Swiss-Prot record, chain D:
Protein's name according to its UniProt entry: Large ribosomal subunit protein uL3
Subcellular location, record wording: Nucleus, Nucleolus; Cytoplasm
Zinc as UniProt keyword: no
Cross-link (Glycyl lysine isopeptide (Lys-Gly) (interchain with G-Cter in SUMO2)): K38, K223, K225, K285, K365, K385, K392
Gene name linked to the record: RPL3
Species assigned in the record: Oryctolagus cuniculus (Rabbit)
Modification comment: Constitutively monomethylated at His-244 by METTL18. Methylation at His-244 regulates translation elongation by slowing ribosome traversal on tyrosine codons: slower elongation provides enough time for proper folding of synthesized proteins and prevents cellular aggregation of tyrosine-rich proteins. It is not required for incorporation of RPL3 into ribosomes.
Residues with PTM N6-acetyllysine: K135, K285, K293, K365, K372
Residues recorded as bearing Tele-methylhistidine in the entry: H244
Quaternary structure annotation from Swiss-Prot or TrEMBL: Component of the large ribosomal subunit. Interacts with DHX33.
Cross-link (Glycyl lysine isopeptide (Lys-Gly) (interchain with G-Cter in SUMO1)): K293
Domain of life: Eukaryota
PANTHER family: 60S RIBOSOMAL PROTEIN L3-RELATED (PTHR11363), LARGE RIBOSOMAL SUBUNIT PROTEIN UL3 (PTHR11363:SF4)
Modified positions (Phosphoserine) in chain numbering: S12, S303
UniProtKB/Swiss-Prot annotation, chain E:
Gene: RPL34
Parent-protein start and end of this portion: 2 to 58 of 117
Compartment list: Cytoplasm, Cytosol; Cytoplasm; Endoplasmic reticulum
One of the record's GO cellular component terms: cytosol
One GO term of the biological process aspect: translation
Positions of modified residues (N6-acetyllysine): K35, K42
The protein, known as: Large ribosomal subunit protein eL34
Protein species of origin: Oryctolagus cuniculus (Rabbit)
Length: 60, 153, 15, 394, 57
RNA sequence: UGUUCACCCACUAAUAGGGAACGUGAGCUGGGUUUAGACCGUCGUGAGACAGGUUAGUUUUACCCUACUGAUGAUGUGUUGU
RNA sequence: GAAUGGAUGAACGAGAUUCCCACUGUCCCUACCUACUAUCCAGCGAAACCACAGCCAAGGGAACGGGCUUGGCGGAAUCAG
RNA sequence: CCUCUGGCAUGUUGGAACAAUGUAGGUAAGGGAAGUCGGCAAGCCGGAUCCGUAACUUCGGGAUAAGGAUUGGCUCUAAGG
RNA sequence: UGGAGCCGCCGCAGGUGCAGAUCUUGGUGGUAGUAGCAAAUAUUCAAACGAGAACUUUGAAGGCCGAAGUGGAGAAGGGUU
């Protein structure tokens, strides 16, 4: 429905951008009733919200 | 309330109006003239064509700058447009008239849109900022619409 | 009202 | 004050309302005067601009620096399959003008032709001339026809034949054949009318109408170029770089005091798709179409007495934005009006032609057939195959 | 690269607002504000230009 | 040469003369006149002046009517096409 | 015309001129291409200006008329310019 | 000029066309300032290395004066701690 | 139509009669569905929510800002944004 709050918090929990936050688009409803962080920290451990890897910039 | 032009036989004539609607008076006016005197089941069809640009609404009076279109030849006119909001609003009005005819107990598919009338409604206003620190109006011109169907078949 | 002309433009100048 | 430095004016006033031509097929505005003495003939034909190419020829104007020298010369091909006469039509002289008096149509008329009478054919039931053709098979109708011709024989002066193209035979997209009135010029009206009556429902090829090395006048609509500014449409001066409100304009429309802009001032509008009547286009070569006796005779087109190959006037990869000229064609010197595929009215000259250039007999020595669709370098495919040899697609 | 911010409301780089980098246990570079450099006392005699020995500057 | 005007070169068949709000700035340009800055000369006690010279100096608006250019259309002919 | 400074003068100048070399669509003489507009549509939506208005020729007239006189004439509604 | 970290949704809208005028970019045969008040505008020039550098001069400059040549990729060699 | 006061005659009294004042205050037209919503490259596909999606959100792709940032923090000013 609307996951701008979740994406903000997620990023503050991860200590990444929110470029890097990934929310599973299948399991949206679960994410939408996450409101607090530590609800979000639970979701991170389950693998619904994830930190994406860095965009590779080779030096080679 | 009192409508302008009360019907000939109220027994078998349904009514509707919509006051103070945010719809361009001029556009609405013209699409109401096009629709006037149709059979209701034609009229709904026509307005839906106007929504999809399969039939136009000729702009006869308020026609300044309005473009020409092939679709207007039907009407015997060169100007024409596809005012989508105006259709959308007096599709709802028809819907409500059809509702009322059904409530009154009239043959819905005998109803000819006998009388329809778009009147100017009191203007809204918001402002537009212009060159050299002037502030002009940028006003909406909304309308009241009102209409009368009648069993004729 | 509209700006129109500058103060030292003085449109229809006929000295 | 007077204009300082004189210059002649831009564009002609003898060509204006520079507007979009109401017709598409160019009208023969005036057919030649029938001297009732020489034998009957059609005056005009109706062709299609297929394209352009070179020619080469020895030239025979004594005195010139180009006498007995080979020159090259641009030509238009005009694919002109034979015309079917479907009607005749009598005109009567009046002080008002030249009233049309009686139109007799033929019995059978092709769908090529019928097409023209409807704006939509797909939709129509194709009922045109249905009740008309009934007339040709009964006593009352056949008697009514015979009286109508006899009335035309009595009262009419000018007789034009209604002919139409054989759209069937062209590579074009359209099937809707062009009709056209063509003036019969020749002997007495009766003799003229009997000839047309004989030609009804019959083909009329080009070579009947025109001969070779004949000056003709091409009549057609110009290649249309939309709305165009005054600098394109009238070739006025461009104003210099600095001009604040644009420079592809005319600066002074008009003086103050005839306080109206004149019709003689240059304004922007429709450029092209005008009706135009060019004159003195010499037919270099009337060509024969493809035909069969056992196999194809493709040679008879672009082969000459000095080349003797097996070419067609079709260049490699066809004429561009057109097709294969399979039918009989004329070959005019120079350009002609209009775009490719454009229907084109040819008309015998309005003019007694007795100039040294207008009586020159043309023997072509070489017709170029190299591709136009890019810089072509081989005349024919068989020549290319020899030069290149085998390719990987073998 | 980890860019960083001042830790106080004093934005302007001043004599007061001198800093240094420090990596923490948390594995982040952070600013610590530095104390000013103290000077050893000069001699009363007023001719010997060097500053005194055996005194914490 | 800001010039109109003028003169000279060159070509030409000829390099005739004029008008249109000294045609034509919501067509341009702004070189010149003709604001404000400044320089020189002459004049003025002076502020300042100079059909005396010099240099630097904002060129607005059209979507209204008409006109013209092109573009759809209009009344008539029963309708429609040719 | 002489510190109301005269005469000079390297270096410097978004200062004022003149010529030459190079270079060029400045021009002969214009053409084509691209983007954003203008264009048409949906939605939204101002202003200035406005005696009435809005086809001309000539006349006379406050001595250059849309209106008056005498002639020419006049055909809905509009679009881009 | 291109990229990662981080950040945005093209700056108060969209769609369909690709006319004239424009605004902003380009390119032009042959000529080369004939254009114009006036080379305005644009174009030439441009980096580095190696040569080479006039008048005049306050002897500092002028000076990147002017005018030339070279420049890529690859495989080696030599020289510097 | 409206729903609570008003007039004739004789006298008296006046802040007593509007077309104008580039009049004052308020309202409404034509212009006009017109000018316009063109600075800074850019969007596309799917799903979700939802009465309703060109614009919200999630995912995927393509792009830009390109550490003198369209990033991360403050000062003044704002004052709950
Ligand atoms: Mg504004
Ligand atoms: Mg302001
Ligand atoms: Mg003259
Ligand atoms: Mg300018
Ligand atoms: Mg070609
Ligand atoms: Mg302090
Ligand atoms: Mg004048
Ligand atoms: Mg003017
Ligand atoms: Mg001007
Ligand atoms: Mg000046
Ligand atoms: Mg001055
Ligand atoms: Mg417009
Ligand atoms: Mg003196
Ligand atoms: Mg002096
Ligand atoms: Mg007037
Ligand atoms: Mg953009
Ligand atoms: Mg956007
Ligand atoms: Mg913004
Ligand atoms: Mg060139
Ligand atoms: Mg000149
Ligand atoms: Mg010159
Ligand atoms: Mg320059
Ligand atoms: Mg020098
Ligand atoms: Mg009461
Ligand atoms: Mg009182
Ligand atoms: Mg009043
Ligand atoms: Mg618009
Ligand atoms: Mg960039
Ligand atoms: Mg922040
Ligand atoms: Mg910031
Ligand atoms: Zn001491």
């Amino acid at each position: 429905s609307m996951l701008r709050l979740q994406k903000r918090l997620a990023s503050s929990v991860l200590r990444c951008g929110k470029k890097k936050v990934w929310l599973d688009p299948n399991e949206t409803n679960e994410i939408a009733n996450a409101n607090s962080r530590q609800q979000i920290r639970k979701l991170i451990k389950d693998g619904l919200i994830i930190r994406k890897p860095v965009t590779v910039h080779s030096r080679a | 309330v009192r409508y302008s032009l009360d019907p000939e036989n109220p027994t078998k004539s349904c009514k509707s109006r919509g006051s103070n609607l945010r719809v361009h008076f001029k556009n609405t006016r013209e699409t109401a003239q096009a629709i006037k005197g149709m059979h209701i089941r034609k009229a709904t069809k026509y307005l839906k064509d106007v929504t999809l640009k399969k039939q136009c609404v000729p702009f006869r009076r308020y026609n300044g700058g309005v473009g020409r279109c092939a679709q207007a030849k039907q009407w015997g006119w060169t100007q024409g447009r596809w005012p989508k909001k105006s259709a959308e609003f007096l599709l709802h009005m028809l819907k409500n008239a059809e509702s009322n005819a059904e409530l009154k107990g009239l043959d819905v598919d005998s109803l000819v849109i006998e009388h329809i009338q778009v009147n100017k409604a009191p203007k809204m206003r918001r402002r537009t900022y212009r060159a050299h620190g002037r502030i002009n109006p940028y006003m909406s011109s909304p309308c009241h619409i009102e209409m009368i169907l009648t069993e004729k078949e | 009202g509209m700006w129109r002309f500058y103060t030292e433009d003085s449109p229809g100048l006929k000295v | 004050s007077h204009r300082k430095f004189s210059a002649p004016r831009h564009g002609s006033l003898g060509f204006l309302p520079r507007k979009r031509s109401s017709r598409h097929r160019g009208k023969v505005k005036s057919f030649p005067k029938d001297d009732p003495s020489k034998p009957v003939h059609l005056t005009a034909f109706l062709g299609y601009k297929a394209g352009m190419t070179h020619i080469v020829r020895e030239v025979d104007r004594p005195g010139s620096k180009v006498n007995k020298k080979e020159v090259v010369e641009a030509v238009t091909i005009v694919e002109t399959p034979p015309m079917v006469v479907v009607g005749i039509v009598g005109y009567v002289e009046t002080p008002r003008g030249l009233r049309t008096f009686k139109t007799v149509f033929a019995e059978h008329i092709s769908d090529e032709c019928k097409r023209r009478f409807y704006k939509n054919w797909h939709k129509s039931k194709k009922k045109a001339f249905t009740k008309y053709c009934k007339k040709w098979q009964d006593d009352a109708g056949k008697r009514q026809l015979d009286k109508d011709f006899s009335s035309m024989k009595k009262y009419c002066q000018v007789i034009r034949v209604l002919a139409h193209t054989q759209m069937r035979l062209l590579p074009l997209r359209q099937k809707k054949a062009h009709l056209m009135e063509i003036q019969v010029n020749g002997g007495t009206v009766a003799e003229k009318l009997d000839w047309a009556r004989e030609r009804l429902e019959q083909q009329v090829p080009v070579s009947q109408v025109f001969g070779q090395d004949e000056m003709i006048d091409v009549i057609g609509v110009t290649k249309g170029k939309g709305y165009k500014g005054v600098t394109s449409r009238w070739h006025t001066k461009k104003l210099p770089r600095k001009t604040h409100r644009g420079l592809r304009k005319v600066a002074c429309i008009g003086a103050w005091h005839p306080a109206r802009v004149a019709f003689s001032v240059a304004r922007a509008g429709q450029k092209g798709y005008h009706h135009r009547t060019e004159i003195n286009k010499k037919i270099y070569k009337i060509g024969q179409g493809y035909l069969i006796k056992d196999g194809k005779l493709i040679k008879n087109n672009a082969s000459t007495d000095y080349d003797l190959s097996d070419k067609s006037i079709n260049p490699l990869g066809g004429f561009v934005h057109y097709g294969e000229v399979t039918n009989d064609f004329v070959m005019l010197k120079g350009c002609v009006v209009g775009t490719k595929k454009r229907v084109l009215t040819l008309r015998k000259s309005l003019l007694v032609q007795t100039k040294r250039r207008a009586l020159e007999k043309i023997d072509l020595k070489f017709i170029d057939t190299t591709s136009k669709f890019g810089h072509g370098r081989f005349q024919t495919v068989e020549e290319k195959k020899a030069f290149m040899g085998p390719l990987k697609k073998d | 690269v980890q860019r960083l911010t001042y830790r106080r409301r004093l934005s302007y780089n001043t004599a007061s607002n001198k800093t240094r980098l420090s990596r923490t246990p948390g594995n982040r570079i952070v600013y610590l504000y530095t104390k000013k450099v103290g000077k050893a006392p000069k001699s009363a005699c007023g001719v010997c230009p060097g500053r005194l020995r055996g005194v914490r500057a």
